[PDB]
Amino acid sequence: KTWVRYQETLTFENMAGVFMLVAGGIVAGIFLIFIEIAYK
Amino acid sequence: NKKEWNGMMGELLSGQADMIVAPLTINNERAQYIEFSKPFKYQGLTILVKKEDSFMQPFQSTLWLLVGLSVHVVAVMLYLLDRFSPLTLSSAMWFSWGVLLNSGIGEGAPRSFSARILGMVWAGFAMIIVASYTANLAAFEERITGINDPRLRNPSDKFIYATVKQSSVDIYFRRQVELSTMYRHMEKHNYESAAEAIQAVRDNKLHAFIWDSAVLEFEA
Amino acid sequence: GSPRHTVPQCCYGFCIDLLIKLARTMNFTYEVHLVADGKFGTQERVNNS
Amino acid sequence: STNEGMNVKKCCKGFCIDILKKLSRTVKFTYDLYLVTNGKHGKKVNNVWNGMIGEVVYQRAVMAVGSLTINEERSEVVDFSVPFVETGISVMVS
Amino acid sequence: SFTIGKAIWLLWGLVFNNSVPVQNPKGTTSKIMVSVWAFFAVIFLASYTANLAAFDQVTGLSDKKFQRPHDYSPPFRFGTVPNGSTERNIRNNYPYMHQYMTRFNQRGVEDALVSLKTGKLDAFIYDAAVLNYKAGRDEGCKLVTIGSGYIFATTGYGIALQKGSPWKRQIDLALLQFVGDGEMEELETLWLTGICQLDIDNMAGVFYMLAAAMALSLITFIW
Amino acid sequence: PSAFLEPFSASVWVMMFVMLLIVSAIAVFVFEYFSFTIGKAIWLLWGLVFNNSVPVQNPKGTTSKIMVSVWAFFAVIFLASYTANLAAFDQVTGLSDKKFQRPHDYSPPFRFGTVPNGST
Amino acid sequence: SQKCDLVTTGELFFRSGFGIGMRKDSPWKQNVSLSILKSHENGFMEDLD
């Protein structure tokens, strides 16, 4: 009784590649937007 | 060429000890040398472990290019129907990427007297594709469970199991002749005390540890 | 159900082929008649004695 | 139709053949290896064995160098050596 | 303002709500009907996702699947080999399991292997390490056992001699010499192996219905 | 299911504010190159997640609609991951259950007892 | 295998021996028993299954 009975989508490592590919897609989209602005 | 003992039995046979108040393990060698008493503790062994998404790149890239070529062909044939009526190309691309956008865009409605059917079928087609994608993403080994495991007979750098150096549990594992490979695995990671084993398993350096049951229940 | 209506019909199946195999092994014939009721049989008390 | 047959010579390799060759190197005896023609590993059908148990127990073979499982009936009819590998039972599924 | 006869596009664009503007609703009745139809579309999409969500096997020797697979809809079957010690191990363990094997009999080792490769067999009780070898030499790591023999019998092999053979002690000493120097580990390393969401028909049928939709759009375009 | 700390975990929220600041700076740069999206870009960017925002008239230079579509696809896959997190989030079958040995297969443990020194 | 609504339950007990109900002491029982044993030793139930 005194010893035995007496008791008392992670986005850290899994979605790291998710963050890397989303950031790469964002950088590619921003590059396409600035090329579209510099063209027209 | 004499076999001796050490620790508590090294002091008992040499006169530096008279009464061992300790969890002494009953086996063949210690019962024939010294006398035993009534066993007050009934306790067994157990294994201490550490029990604590194919989006685009692990997912196969055939249907993504298929949807891209599909929306390209849809935009081309809607632009050709806008040519053959029964910023034109920019508004056509805006409509074709705003139907698929599925969140809200500041647009209008193009002249679709013979093209509203294609737009409504493409809208339902895009939503049933993303619904099936959500469905089959939502619908879609650390434990050891004993000593009878051939995965531990062929270990690796992940299947790490050890025991206390110079222990009676190691004597019982050495006595059985079919436990040679696990003995050779545990002798490479010999640990002195139990607190060092707890510190090693806490810092993600271990994956299994043979230890008595009630002590780990108290630690749990 | 019926007072008296028993006609010659065709019997086959699993036990009939077993009996044909038994008649093929040892040289004997048979004669299949059907049971009247549809009960297996228990130890029933009769109304007399 | 009958028990007529011919003596076909065939080559053997593998794990138990390596065990047989290492026993022929260590103990230095001449092996008389032949495949069994009665059947599989063994099952007693009305005091009639078959396979390696039927060859060893009925005084037609001396020993079983090849792979042979251990149960109660084979511990009763003959005696085994020390174990060297843990090959239990499992279930292959699709 | 096209709700005279052309309400089909507006109505089935408000089913999925893919950001398709149509008109500015000034009537209260129209917005109430659109809100009720949108709530119906939301609960219909919830029922559709519930239908899509509702649409290791044996984890022990005392499992109910060995009795009957009634817990699930597809049934399975299994069997062992005749004239072997595995059947005697089953008869010593459970004669009920021997009668389960007697109902679902089979031919042999290679026949059960062909039945596993072609799909004519679900489960097959065999040895522990030999099925691991067959899984390792399997092309593509397909045939994988449930575990590797955790709470199974875990038996071993040996060398059987005659009762009273004087050559037994020398063979025992030779086997103790072969095991206790790493030679048996070399034999177990050399002569063993070490190698070992998506659907097809549904979007194909959706593609057939899409081809029918393109045919109907071509019919409405030519007339 | 009292409160969830799994998707954002108070570490990704800083990246949400950084992306809001970047989209606001891009909107200021486009408005300088060229309409309430000068300092109010938060309601226009984060408001397009729950697909009932007010339609804002995009410029004709094909600038805002591409990043709106990218953020819309990000919101769709974020809601898909949220539904997957919700989907991933009788007790005792009998004597054949693994709970009688140890309920370590599940998260909560339990306990049981009979009469002391009895026939049970 | 005929219909799609006949699924057996998990309960299966009283697994007795179904055979042939024979008469009393008679010399025409041993040959029948040898024929049944001849059916046991070969694949007589397997092909009928």
Ligand SMILES: *[C@@H]1O[C@H](CO)[C@@H](O)[C@H](O)[C@H]1NC(C)=O
């Ligand atoms: C079968 O026919 C033979 C004919 O000689 C004879 O033994 C007997 O009449 C029959 N009995 C057996 C052996 O089935």
Ligand SMILES: *[C@@H]1O[C@H](CO)[C@@H](O)[C@H](O)[C@H]1NC(C)=O
């Ligand atoms: C016996 O008497 C009962 C009526 O008490 C009747 O129904 C039955 O047919 C009779 N026959 C027997 C022996 O059961």
Ligand SMILES: *[C@@H]1O[C@H](CO)[C@@H](O)[C@H](O)[C@H]1NC(C)=O
């Ligand atoms: C076992 O071996 C015998 C021959 O000894 C053979 O007739 C039988 O078919 C084999 N298997 C069975 C089903 O017992």
Ligand SMILES: *[C@@H]1O[C@H](CO)[C@@H](O)[C@H](O)[C@H]1NC(C)=O
């Ligand atoms: C049939 O049974 C008799 C004993 O009643 C026996 O002597 C005879 O050999 C048996 N014949 C065959 C073919 O089994």
